[PDB]
From a paper:
Microbial ion-pumping rhodopsins (MRs) are extensively studied retinal-binding membrane proteins. The green-light absorbing proteorhodopsin (GPR) was originally discovered in marine γ-proteobacteria as the first bacterial rhodopsin and as an example of a new type of bacterial phototrophy. The bacterial green-light absorbing proton pump proteorhodopsin (GPR) has emerged as a model protein for MRs and is used here to address these open questions using cryo-electron microscopy (cryo-EM) and molecular dynamics (MD) simulations. GPR possesses an N-terminal signal sequence, akin to numerous membrane proteins, that is hypothesised to guide the correct insertion of the protein into the plasma membrane before subsequent proteolytic removal.
To this end, we expressed the GPR-A18L variant, introducing an alanine to leucine substitution (A18L) known to prevent cleavage of the signal peptide in the blue-light absorbing proteorhodopsin (BPR) when expressed in E. coli. Upon careful examination of the hexameric GPR map, two α-helical densities were identified in the central cavity, challenging the initially assumed C6 symmetry and revealing a C2 symmetry instead. In contrast, two α-helical densities were discovered filling the central cavity of the GPR-A18L hexamer, corresponding to the N-termini of protomers 1 and 4. Accommodation of additional signal peptides in the cavity is restricted due to their tilt of ~30° relative to the membrane normal. If two signal peptides occupy the space that will form the central cavity of the oligomer, this expands the diameter and thus permits the assembly of six protomers. The interfaces between protomers 1 and 4 are mainly formed by hydrophobic interactions where the signal peptides intersect and where they interact with TMH A of the opposing protomer. This includes a hydrogen bond formed between the two serine residues at position 10 and a salt bridge between K3 and D53 on TMH A. In total, these additional interactions, formed by the signal peptides with neighbouring protomers, account for an increased oligomerisation interface area compared to the pentamer of around 1400 Å2 (about 25% more), as calculated by PISA30. Interestingly, protomers 1 and 4 exhibit slight differences compared to the other protomers, likely due to the interaction of their signal peptides in the centre of the hexamer. This conformational change mainly affects the extracellular halves of TMHs E and F, and is also noticeable in the position of the retinal chromophore.
Author numbering:
A (entry chain B), C (entry chain F), D (entry chain E), E (entry chain C): 23 to 210, 219 to 250
B (entry chain A), F (entry chain D): 1 to 210, 219 to 250
The structure:
C-alpha cells in the first residue's frame, strides 16, 4: 500500500491481522479453562473469525473499488453482535443459574436493532424512525443488562465474575456507542473509526472473558 | 497445539476459496441473505463440531448430527449461491436436495435425544420421517409443475399438521412423560419450532404461488441454528451433572 | 446439471453429499466407542470416503461425457466390497475370538467375484460364465457367513452383536442383489438404481455397525 | 480414462486410492495400540504415504508421456524398502530385546541392493554384476532374518508376534521376488505387475503389523 | 534474490525461516508446560507468527520495489510489542498474584510510544517531539518494570521466574534500543540491522520464556 | 478422529503443490538426489512430529528440535530445487542459509539430551556453537570467492577438528561420565556421526575446489535423518521406563 498517504489500508491490515491472531488465540486457549468455560472462549473465537472473514471480503471490495460497502459491515454486525451479547448469558450460565429468557430477550433486541439499522442505511425506511427504534432496542438491552435479570444474575456471582461483568457492561455502554454516532454523522474518515471500534469491541471483550474464565477455572 | 494450529489455519484459509460474490448493495436482498446464511451455517458447523468436548458420551451424537445438518446446508447454500450468480432464477432442485438430506437428520434428533435421555420405541421417528418424506415429495412435484399449486400445498399442509399432531399428542408425549425437566423443556421448544419455525416455509411457499428465496433463507437460518442451539443447551445441561 | 429434466444428476448430487456426511460422521463418532470398536468405525468411514472420491470422479466423467463409465464403478466396487465384507470379521473380532481364516476367505471370494464381474463387463471372457462364477462366489460367501465359520462365530456373541450380524446378513442378501440384477439386465435408467443401492449399502451398513458399536461400548 | 482398452490407468488409480486409504487407515489406528506399537503403525503409514506421493508423480508423468519412468520407481523403492525392512526391527524392539546391529545390517543391505539395482537399470554398471550384487544383498538379508539375529529375536516372543514375523518373512521371500524377476525380464506389461506387487507388499505388510499390534496391546 | 551481491535478501530469508521455526516450536511445546504456563508459549508463538506474516509481506514489497516499506515494519511493531511487553504480566500472573493494572499501563505506554514513532516516521508531527515522547514512554515502562509495580511483583517470585524476569529486563533495555537508534540515524544498510534485532528480540525472548516455563512446570 | 483426519488430508494434499520437477532419467543425478532428499526430509519431519506421543515430558523437546531441523531443511531444499530448475548452478547461498539455521539446532541436541538425562553446565554447547559458526563463516567466505580455497578449507578443517576434540575429551566426556548406558551409547553414536558423517562435507568441498550437490544432498540426508533417529531411539528407550 501507500506510505503516509492513506490510513484506511493500514487500518484494514492491522485489524485483519489482529483478528486472525485473536481467533487463533481463543481457539488455542480453550485447553486451559474447565468444562464450564469451554464455550465462552469458542463463541469469542467465532466472533473474531467471522469478523476476520468479512474484513477480508471488505478489503477485497476496497481494492476493487475505493468506496465503503456498509452492507458488508451490517452483515458482519448481524452475525457478531448476537454472539457478543450472548456472551453475557454464557458467562452467567457458566458462573451461576440463569432462567433462559435473558438470552431470548437479548437476542431479539439485538436482531431488531440491527435489522432496523440496516433498513435505515439502505433507505427502506426513513432514517429517523430506524435510528429511534435502534436506540430504543439498545437502551432496552442496557436496562436489562444493568438493572433487570442480568443485574440479578450478576448479584449472585464470584467477585471475578462480577468484575468481568462490570467491565463488559462498561464496554457495551461506551465502546458500542461509536456506531450510532457514525450512523447519525452519515445521516444528518469513518472506516478508520469503525475499524478501531471493532478492534476494541472484538478483542478487549474476548480478552476480558478469557481472563475471567482462566481465573475461575484455575481453582482446580 | 501446533497440530491443532494446522486445523485453525485450514479453517481460516477455507474462506479464501470463497473469493466473494457480492455485486450490489441495497438493491437485492437475495445475495445479502445468501452470504448471511452461508456464513452463519459455517459458524454453527464449527461451533457444533467444537462443543463436543463439554457433552458426555451419551450426548456426543446429538451435537455431531446437528453439525452435519449445518454443514450439508452450508455446502448446498454455496452451490445455490453459485447457481444464483450464474443465473438469477430459483434453485428449486438444490433446495429440495438439501431438504431431503437435512430434514431426516433434524427429525432424527428427536429420537436421538429421547434415546440418550430415556427409553423410547422410536416409532415416532419413523412415522415423522415418512410424513416429512411425503411432504417433501409433494412439494417438489408442485414446484416442478407436475401438480397444481393449491392441491400440492393443501396436501403438504395436511401432512405437516399430521406430523405436528403426532409430535404433540402421539408417542412423543408418552416419551416426554418419563424424562428430566430439562429434556421436557427442550422437547417443548422443539415442538414449538416445528409448529412455528417450519410454518415459515408454507406461507413463503404461498407467496410464490398466488421474494421466496429470502424467506427460505431466513427459515433455514432459524430451523437449523436455533434447533441445534436448543439441542446443545439441553445436552450441556444434562451432561454437566457429570 | 439440468433441472427437472434428468434424475441422474440429482442422484449424483444426493449420494455425493450423503456419502460425505457419512464419512464425517463415522470419522467423528470414533470418540464414543471403546478401543475394541474404534476399527469397526474407521473402516466404514474409509468405505464412505472412497465411495465419495470415486463418485466425484464419476460425476466429472459424466459432465465431460454423457455415458456410463462402468470402469470407475467397478474400481469403486473393487475397493469398497472387501472392506464392507471384512466388517463382519472386524465386529466378530471385537465381540468374540475369530481364527482369522474367515477374513481371508471372505476377501478372496469378494475379489474373485468382482474381478470376474469386471471381466464379464469388459468382454474379456464370455458374459454368462463370468456371471455364473460371480454368482457362485457370492453364494459361497453367503453360505460361509450364514452356515459356515461366520455363523459359528456369531453363535457365541452378545445379543446386540448377533442382531447386528443378522441385519448385516439380510442387507448382504437383499440390497447387494441389485448389482447382479443390473448386470443381467445389461447383458442378456441404471445409474439412478446403482446410486440408490450405493446409498443404502454404504450408509445403512455403517449406521448399523455404529449403532451396535455404541450399544456395546457405552455399557461400560 | 479409456474403458476396456488400457489396464495401466486402472491399476494406477486403484493403487493410488488404496495407498491413500491405507495411509489414513494407519494414521488413524495409532489410537488403539499401546505405547510400544505407536511406531510400527507410524512407519507403515509413512511407507504408504510416500508410495502414494510417488504414485501421483508417476501418474502425472504417464499422463504427460506414455512411457515407464523407472527412475521414479527406484526413488520410491529407495525410500520405502528401508522402512519396510526396519519394521522387523521395530516389532522386535516393541516385543522383545534387540541388540541394535540388526537394524544397521538390515539398512545397509537394503541400501546396497537398491543402489546397485538403480545403477544397473541406469546403465552405470553392467546388468549382470548389479543383479548379482542385489541378489546377494537380498539373500543376506533373508539369511539374517531367517537364521541369524532376527530368528534369535523371534524365538523369544509371544505366539502372536511369532506368527506375524513368520507371515512377514514369507511376504519378504515371495512377494518381493517379483521385482528381481521383472528386472531380469527387462534385461535379458510390467507396470501392472509392479503396481500389484506394491499393493501387496505395501498394504498386506502394514495390515499384518497392525493386526499383531492390536492383538498385543489389547491385553490392557 | 541476488547471490553474493546484497545481504538484505539473505537476512530476509534467514529471519523468515527462523521465525517460522520458532512459531512451530512454541505452538508445539505447549504440551510440556503445565496449565499455568500454556499462555506464555501461546503468546510467544503468536508474536513469532505475526512477525513471519509481516515479514513475508515485506519481502513481497521489497521484491516488487527496492525501497524501505517502514509502514509495514511499524504495523508489525504495533502488533508485536504489546504482546512481548505483556509477556511480563503473563509470567508474573503464572508465578504470583498481580492486580492487573501493570498490564494496562504497559499496553498504554507501548501503544503510545509506537503511535508517536509512527507519526514521527510519517512526518505528521515534528520528528524531535515524537522521538522525545517515545523515549519518555520507553523510560516510563522501564521504570515500571524495574522499580515500580513490576519490580514489586518480581520480588515475590520463585528464583527461576526472577532470573527470567531479569534476563527479559536486560533484553528490553539492550536489544530494543536498536530501533530508536535506527530512528535517530534516519532522522537527524538499516534493514539488515532491523532484521537481526527482530531475530533476537522475537526468538531469544520466547526461548527464555519457554525455558522458565518448562523449568517451573516439570517440577510438578 | 475426524479433526485429525483434516490434518491427515492436509498432509496428503501438501505434495499436490509440488506438481513435480522431474525432467530427465538416468542423465543427471542432481534432480534425482534433490527429490530423494526432499521426500525423505518431509517423511522424517512427519515422523518426528508424530512420535512425540511415546516419549515422556523430558524428551518431548529432543524430538521437536529434530523435527524442525528436518522441516527447515525440507523448506530450503524445495527452494534449492526451484532455483536449480530455474538455473542449473550451485545454490551456495541457500545451502549456507540452511546450514546456519540447522547446525545450531543439531549441536543444541547435545545440550538438550545432556540436560534431560543428567546435569551439565552447558558450556560445551556454547563453545561448539561458536566453533560451528566460525566454520560456516569461513566456508561462506571461501565459496563467495573472498578467500582462497586452500586457506579457508584448512581453517574450516581445523575448527571442525577442534569441535571433535571438544566432543571427545572436553566437557562432553565429563557430562557423559554421569549418565545412563543408553545415553552414553547415544552420545558415542552422535560423536561418531560428527567425526565421520560431517566429514562428508569437507571432502566433497575439496571435490569442488581442486557433483558437489549430490555429495551435499547425501550428507544432509545422513546427518539430519540418522541423527534424529538416534535421538528418537535414545528418547524412547529412556522414556519407556515409565
Ligand atoms: C463487532 C461489531 C459490533 C459490536 C457492532 C455493534 C453495532 C451497534 C451497536 C449498532 C447500533 C445501531 C444503533 C443503536 C442505531 C442506529 C443503527 C445502528 C445499527 C448503527
Ligand atoms: C433445512 C430445511 C428445512 C427444515 C426445510 C423445511 C421445509 C418445510 C417444512 C416445507 C414445507 C412445505 C409445506 C408444509 C407445504 C407446502 C410445500 C412445502 C414443501 C413448502
Ligand atoms: C458399494 C458397492 C457395493 C456394495 C457393490 C457390490 C457389488 C456386487 C455385490 C456385485 C456383484 C456381481 C455379481 C454377484 C455377479 C455378476 C457381476 C457383479 C460384479 C455385478
Ligand atoms: C514397495 C516396494 C518394494 C517393497 C520394493 C522392493 C524391491 C526389491 C526387493 C528390488 C530388488 C532388486 C534386486 C534384488 C536385484 C536387482 C535389482 C532390484 C532393485 C530390482
Ligand atoms: C518485534 C519488534 C519489536 C520488539 C520492536 C520494538 C520497537 C521499539 C522498542 C521502538 C521504539 C521507538 C522509540 C523508543 C522512540 C522512537 C520511535 C520508535 C518507534 C523507533
Ligand atoms: C544440515 C547440514 C549440515 C549438518 C551441514 C554441515 C556442514 C559442514 C560440517 C561443513 C563443513 C566444512 C568444513 C569442515 C571445512 C570446509 C568448508 C565446509 C563449510 C564445507
Amino acid at each position: 500500500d501507500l506510505d503516509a498517504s492513506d490510513y484506511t489500508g493500514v487500518s484494514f491490515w492491522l485489524v485483519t491481522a489482529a483478528l486472525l491472531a485473536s481467533t487463533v488465540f481463543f481457539f488455542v486457549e480453550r485447553d486451559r479453562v474447565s468444562a464450564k468455560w469451554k464455550t465462552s472462549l469458542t463463541v469469542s473465537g467465532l466472533v473474531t473469525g467471522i469478523a476476520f472473514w468479512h474484513y477480508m471480503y471488505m478489503r477485497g471490495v476496497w481494492i476493487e473499488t475505493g468506496d465503503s460497502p456498509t452492507v458488508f459491515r451490517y452483515i458482519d454486525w448481524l452475525l457478531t453482535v448476537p454472539l457478543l451479547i450472548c456472551e453475557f448469558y454464557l458467562i452467567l450460565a457458566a458462573a451461576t443459574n440463569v432462567a433462559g429468557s435473558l438470552f431470548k430477550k437479548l437476542l431479539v433486541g439485538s436482531l431488531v436493532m440491527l435489522v432496523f439499522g440496516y433498513m435505515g442505511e439502505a433507505g427502506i425506511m426513513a432514517a429517523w424512525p430506524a435510528f429511534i427504534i435502534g436506540c430504543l432496542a439498545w437502551v432496552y438491552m442496557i436496562y436489562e443488562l444493568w438493572a433487570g435479570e442480568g443485574k440479578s444474575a450478576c448479584n449472585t456471582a464470584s467477585p471475578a465474575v462480577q468484575s468481568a461483568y462490570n467491565t463488559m457492561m462498561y464496554i457495551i455502554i461506551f465502546g458500542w456507542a461509536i456506531y450510532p454516532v457514525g450512523y447519525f454523522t452519515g445521516y444528518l474518515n469513518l472506516n478508520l473509526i469503525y475499524n478501531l471500534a471493532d478492534f476494541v469491541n472484538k478483542i478487549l471483550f474476548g480478552l476480558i472473558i478469557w481472563n475471567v474464565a482462566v481465573k475461575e477455572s484455575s481453582n482446580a
